[PDB]
Design a protein around this ligand. Structure first.
Ligand SMILES: CCCCCCCC(=O)O
Ligand SMILES: [Ca+2]
Length: 114
């Protein structure tokens, strides 16, 4: 279904462990918000856009637009975070940023071949 297997809660788990990170309703691998769910802060909103971008490009998590847009978004994150956020915004963003940089390169390499 569409409204099953998704988050409606602002999480802040494994803040610095990339494969297990869950932040807001959207930030994390194979972790996303239910349709219509407002993101929890600016960083969560960046992830919301990214998750849908991948979804609408044949689940291509190496789509370079999706990933480059995420980096742009991450770099411009500001304002209040959600109450009860056990993570550090800047720290978590840097962890996401590191992984996405690698995704951008991986995407570029595989598309320079085709
Ligand atoms: C730190 C792992 C990277 C998480 C995937 C990118 C953010 C998202 O849109 O969920
Ligand atoms: Ca996600």
């Amino acid at each position: 279904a569409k409204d099953q297997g998704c988050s409606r809660t602002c999480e802040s788990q494994f803040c610095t462990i990339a494969p297990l990170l869950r932040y807001g309703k959207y930030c994390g691998i194979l972790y996303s918000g239910c349709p219509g769910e407002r993101p929890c802060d600016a960083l969560d909103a960046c992830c919301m856009v990214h998750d849908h971008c991948v979804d609408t490009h044949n689940d291509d998590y190496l789509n370079t637009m999706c990933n480059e847009n995420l980096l742009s978004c991450i770099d411009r994150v500001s304002g209040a975070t959600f109450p009860g956020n056990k993570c550090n915004v800047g720290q978590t963003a840097s962890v996401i940023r590191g992984v996405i940089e690698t995704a951008v390169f991986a995407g570029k390499i595989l598309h320079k071949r085709d």
